[PDB]
């Protein structure tokens, strides 16, 4: 999974970052990896895909200062959304903290949002039923209950 | 390893959370709704001794799978958990958000007369995006630094 939290700006997961057919379909031009491993280098396939990549080494822990990467990461994001047809995917390995943190800093630094506003923006665009069959079943439940079943 | 409390006493959470007895114990979880129950594995054995009551719904996260069939039974079970004094339920499946959130939404529609749209907003407004409390403090320090720049 990934969601579009801002035009061109996809917050998504590690499996997506690995899904070459999907990267390809969304037309991802850059990928920001918020759990880059010094060891496991940059991803091969990205070369053979035309994706520009930036890798932040961040550990998902309270002691880790992610602060040091806010400006760099925001500049990268801004450089990708600035290009004609630029689309970026921000993710890490596990948990939303590492990538969501860099998207929020970006919106504060480049779109003048307060932290409250930027959290609101991301949360409103973060999906909970990506399975479209389930959505349709929920819409049918909604229809029945509004006519007046109980 | 996450869960959000998206309605009072009602946690939307993940598989890791479902096998973490330290964490179940501390959050005070009394019921578990597993939207990806396996018939041939049966109920996690750790719940008998935690005193946790369980309902397993066998679902696949596929667009062809008909989850409609479980909306009432899951909704009843969630209603019973929440009606229990001190009751707290964790709703999860093994992967992806769809199976568990779909039942939470049907519950909000059936027991509280929310429209699908109202229930969707209620859940999205309560899923946290920065569980990491240090990162949240760092963002708050950035937010204050910008706000200060503004004073002047």
Curated annotation (Swiss-Prot), chain A:
Cystine connections: none
Subunit structure: Interacts with HSF4.
Organism the protein comes from: Homo sapiens (Human)
Tissues where the protein occurs: Brain. In the brain it is expressed ubiquitously except in the hippocampus. Expressed in embryonal cancers (retinoblastoma, neuroepithilioma and neuroblastoma) and in anaplatic thyroid cancer.
Role played: Inactivates MAPK1 and MAPK3 which leads to dephosphorylation of heat shock factor protein 4 and a reduction in its DNA-binding activity. Inhibits MAP kinase p38 by dephosphorylating it and inhibits p38-mediated apoptosis in anaplastic thyroid cancer cells. Can also induce activation of MAP kinase p38 and c-Jun N-terminal kinase (JNK).
Portion held of the full protein: 61 to 210 of 211
Keyword DNA-binding assigned: no
Enzyme class, UniProt record, top EC level: hydrolase
Keyword annotations: Cytoplasm, Golgi apparatus, Hydrolase, Nucleus, Protein phosphatase
Name of the protein described by the UniProt record: Dual specificity protein phosphatase 26
Origin organism lineage: Eukaryota, Metazoa, Chordata, Craniata, Vertebrata
Domain Tyrosine-protein phosphatase: residue ranges: 1-147
GO BP terms in the entry: negative regulation of ERK1 and ERK2 cascade; negative regulation of MAPK cascade; negative regulation of transcription by RNA polymerase II; positive regulation of cell adhesion; protein dephosphorylation
Family membership noted in the UniProt record: Belongs to the protein-tyrosine phosphatase family. Non-receptor class dual specificity subfamily.
Source organism superkingdom: Eukaryota
Catalytic activity: O-phospho-L-tyrosyl-[protein] + H2O = L-tyrosyl-[protein] + phosphate; O-phospho-L-seryl-[protein] + H2O = L-seryl-[protein] + phosphate; O-phospho-L-threonyl-[protein] + H2O = L-threonyl-[protein] + phosphate
A GO molecular-function descriptor: p53 binding
EC number: 3.1.3.16, 3.1.3.48
Subcellular localization(s) per the UniProt record: Cytoplasm; Nucleus; Golgi apparatus
Main subcellular localisation: cytoplasm
A cellular-component GO term for this protein: extracellular exosome
Catalytic residues as annotated in Swiss-Prot or TrEMBL: 92
Curated annotation (Swiss-Prot), chain B:
Gene Ontology cellular component terms for the protein in this record: cytoplasm; extracellular exosome; Golgi apparatus; nucleoplasm; nucleus
Disulfide bonds: none
One GO MF term: RNA polymerase II-specific DNA-binding transcription factor binding
Annotated Tyrosine-protein phosphatase domain residues: 2-148
Tissue expression remark: Brain. In the brain it is expressed ubiquitously except in the hippocampus. Expressed in embryonal cancers (retinoblastoma, neuroepithilioma and neuroblastoma) and in anaplatic thyroid cancer.
Positions annotated as active site in the UniProt record: 93 (phosphocysteine intermediate)
Major localisation: cytoplasm
Localization of this protein: Cytoplasm; Nucleus; Golgi apparatus
Catalytic activity from the UniProt record: O-phospho-L-tyrosyl-[protein] + H2O = L-tyrosyl-[protein] + phosphate; O-phospho-L-seryl-[protein] + H2O = L-seryl-[protein] + phosphate; O-phospho-L-threonyl-[protein] + H2O = L-threonyl-[protein] + phosphate
EC main group: hydrolase
EC number: 3.1.3.16, 3.1.3.48
GO BP annotation list: negative regulation of ERK1 and ERK2 cascade; negative regulation of MAPK cascade; negative regulation of transcription by RNA polymerase II; positive regulation of cell adhesion; protein dephosphorylation
Keywords: Cytoplasm, Golgi apparatus, Hydrolase, Nucleus, Protein phosphatase
Function per UniProt: Inactivates MAPK1 and MAPK3 which leads to dephosphorylation of heat shock factor protein 4 and a reduction in its DNA-binding activity. Inhibits MAP kinase p38 by dephosphorylating it and inhibits p38-mediated apoptosis in anaplastic thyroid cancer cells. Can also induce activation of MAP kinase p38 and c-Jun N-terminal kinase (JNK).
Subunit structure: Interacts with HSF4.
Family under the similarity heading: Belongs to the protein-tyrosine phosphatase family. Non-receptor class dual specificity subfamily.
Protein name: Dual specificity protein phosphatase 26
Species of origin: Homo sapiens
Upper classification of the organism: Eukaryota, Metazoa, Chordata, Craniata, Vertebrata
Residues of the full protein shown: 61 to 211 of 211
